Amino acid sequence: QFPQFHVKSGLQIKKNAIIDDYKVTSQVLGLGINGKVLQIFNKRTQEKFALKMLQDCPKARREVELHWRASQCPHIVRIVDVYENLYAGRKCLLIVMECLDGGELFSRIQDRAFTEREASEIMKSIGEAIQYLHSINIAHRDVKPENLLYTSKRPNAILKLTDFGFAKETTPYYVAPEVLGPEKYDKSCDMWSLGVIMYILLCGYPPFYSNHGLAISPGMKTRIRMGQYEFPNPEWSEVSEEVKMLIRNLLKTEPTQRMTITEFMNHPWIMQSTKVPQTPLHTSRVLKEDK
Numbered sequence: 001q002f003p004q005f006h007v008k009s010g011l012q013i014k015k016n017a018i019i020d021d022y023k024v025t026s027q028v029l030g031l032g033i034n035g036k037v038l039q040i041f042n043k044r045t046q047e048k049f050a051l052k053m054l055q056d057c058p059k060a061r062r063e064v065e066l067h068w069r070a071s072q073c074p075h076i077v078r079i080v081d082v083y084e085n086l087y088a089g090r091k092c093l094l095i096v097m098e099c100l101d102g103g104e105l106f107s108r109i110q111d112r113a114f115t116e117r118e119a120s121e122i123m124k125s126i127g128e129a130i131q132y133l134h135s136i137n138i139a140h141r142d143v144k145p146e147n148l149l150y151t152s153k154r155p156n157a158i159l160k161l162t163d164f165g166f167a168k169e170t171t172p173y174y175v176a177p178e179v180l181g182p183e184k185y186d187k188s189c190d191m192w193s194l195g196v197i198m199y200i201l202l203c204g205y206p207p208f209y210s211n212h213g214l215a216i217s218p219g220m221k222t223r224i225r226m227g228q229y230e231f232p233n234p235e236w237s238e239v240s241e242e243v244k245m246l247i248r249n250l251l252k253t254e255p256t257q258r259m260t261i262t263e264f265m266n267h268p269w270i271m272q273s274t275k276v277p278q279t280p281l282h283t284s285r286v287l288k289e290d291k
């Protein structure tokens with residue numbers, strides 16, 4: 001009668017040199033805020049891991065903490081251990097994470113081909129990451145395609161959300177959610193980035209791009225501010241006008257008009273991914289030709 005499974009363990013930070021437990025190669029797997037990710041090896045199991053190197057301070061401390069909490073979610077990259085060591089005398093935190101070999105979301109899409117129903121199933125999985133986060137009052141605030149790596153190159157490899165460098169915390173019965181903690185509008189710009197990734201998912205380019213010799217509001221940044229974009233053919237010719245209408249509710253200019261991660265997930269095109277059009281999509285050839 002009690003949520004036993006709801007007790008997860010809080011972080012125990014190892015303070016011995018991480019070079020007892022891992023070989024640490026000089027080779028970089030990626031780059032993220034505050035940290036380069038080197039590839040390391042467990043010295044005992046010889047298994048292969050990702051190491052991010054932050055330098056101690058309330059930013060660093062905050063990433064480890066927030067991220068440790070989100071580590072439980074299946075769709076967020078799993079933390080193996082966190083070490084607090086002395087790196088040349090200056091003190092820093094070391095995050096050891098699982099490895100993700102499937103590449104970025106888009107790279108592992110840019111070779112085949114990709115259909116709507118398949119993008120819907122993909123958009124759902126990112127949504128679960130985002131819906132878990134907001135349910136524990138964390139906003140990621142840098143959800144981009146480069147923060148999305150696949151575990152393996154198997155067809156059954158998971159899509160996982162990396163990097164908590166910019167992630168931030170957001171804090172009777174008929175009481176209203178305002179009173180129960182004001183909560184800014186941070187979860188909001190995850191919802192925006194979800195649209196941007198939904199948009200780039202279906203056609204193969206971003207809704208906002210660089211072009212200056214035109215008519216009204218040239219700036220890459222003015223098009224963002226105004227909310228000036230739309231869905232060209234052919235790329236969008238046959239794309240569900242239900243789906244376009246969904247992308248209209250995340251790419252709202254006004255943060256208060258956007259769709260909440262819950263509304264997003266309950267919304268049909270996501271929820272029932274397994275009963276949307278299986279119709280073709282230009283992504284694979286669009287995203288390939290351009291580059």
Ligand SMILES: C[C@H]1CNC(=O)c2[nH]c3ccc(C(=O)Nc4nc(C(=O)NCCN(C)C)cs4)cc3c21
Nearest residue numbers: 029030031032037050077097098099100101162163
């Ligand atoms: C992303 C980078 C951005 N920010 C993060 O906080 C972050 N956390 C991560 C955890 C695991 C991996 C990971 O699994 N990386 C891997 N990368 C490769 C790889 O093949 N890299 C090649 C890149 N190089 C040739 C330029 C294999 S596994 C990358 C991460 C990143």
